[PDB]
Design a protein around this nucleic acid. Structure first.
Length: 48
DNA sequence: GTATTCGCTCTGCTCCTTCTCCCATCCTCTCGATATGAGATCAACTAG
């Protein structure tokens, strides 16, 4: 255990595995709104 | 004078045809397409 240095009772399965970083980053997805722009036809919040 | 039909109508019954409707939610991104003045009328001035 990294926090206490005690051995973990279960022996953990560990080794090299090929991982991929995918295009989907949270910083390109996070979004918030509070009284922003509105659509012309119906005066409702925009899309996107 | 009643059989007996019998023509004609009145639904009504299946069926085929038409037609109209519907087909999860939410989110991100990219990419392509999408005239000008003259004359007349009228109304406000803008003064005489």
């Amino acid at each position: 255990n990294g926090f206490t240095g005690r051995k973990i009772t279960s022996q953990i399965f560990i080794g090299p595995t090929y991982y991929q970083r995918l295009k989907h980053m949270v910083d390109d997805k996070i979004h918030s709104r509070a009284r922003g722009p509105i659509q012309i036809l119906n005066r409702q919040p925009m899309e996107g």
